[PDB]
From a paper:
In previous work, we have investigated the binding preferences of a PDZ domain that is known to interact with the C-terminus of the cystic fibrosis transmembrane conductance regulator (CFTR). The CFTR-associated ligand (CAL) controls the apical membrane half-life of CFTR and is a validated therapeutic target for the disease cystic fibrosis. We have previously described a peptide array-based approach that enabled us to design a selective inhibitor for the CAL PDZ (CALP) domain. The result was iCAL36, a decameric peptide with sequence ANSRWPTSII.
Author numbering:
A (entry chain C): 5 to 10
B (entry chain A): 284 to 370
């Protein structure tokens, strides 16, 4: 899965 | 677990202080995979690794694709309400 830092 | 409503206070020079994974295209909810120490999510006290983000400021995220969720989440400012659940 994709991981995004937000 | 129980669905929870959680308030987060963010200043404009900061991000939310979380990492998210998942999304509709992967068949899983938007999930908090990291809470970054000292950033707004950590400071608010009510958001934790493993929480699914069901909604933010009334915007339902249960059927949202990963990048859709990023756009929606990053647009929120100031006093931000989350609806979350730990499964």
């Amino acid at each position: 899965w994709p991981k995004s830092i937000i | 677990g129980p669905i929870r409503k959680v308030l987060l206070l963010k200043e404009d020079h900061e991000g939310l202080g979380i990492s998210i994974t998942g999304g509709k295209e992967h068949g899983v909810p938007i999930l908090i995979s990291e809470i970054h120490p000292g950033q707004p999510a950590d400071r608010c006290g009510g958001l934790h690794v493993g929480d699914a983000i069901l909604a933010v400021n009334g915007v339902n995220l249960r059927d949202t694709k990963h990048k859709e969720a990023v756009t929606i989440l990053s647009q929120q400012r100031g006093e931000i309400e989350f609806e979350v659940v730990y499964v």
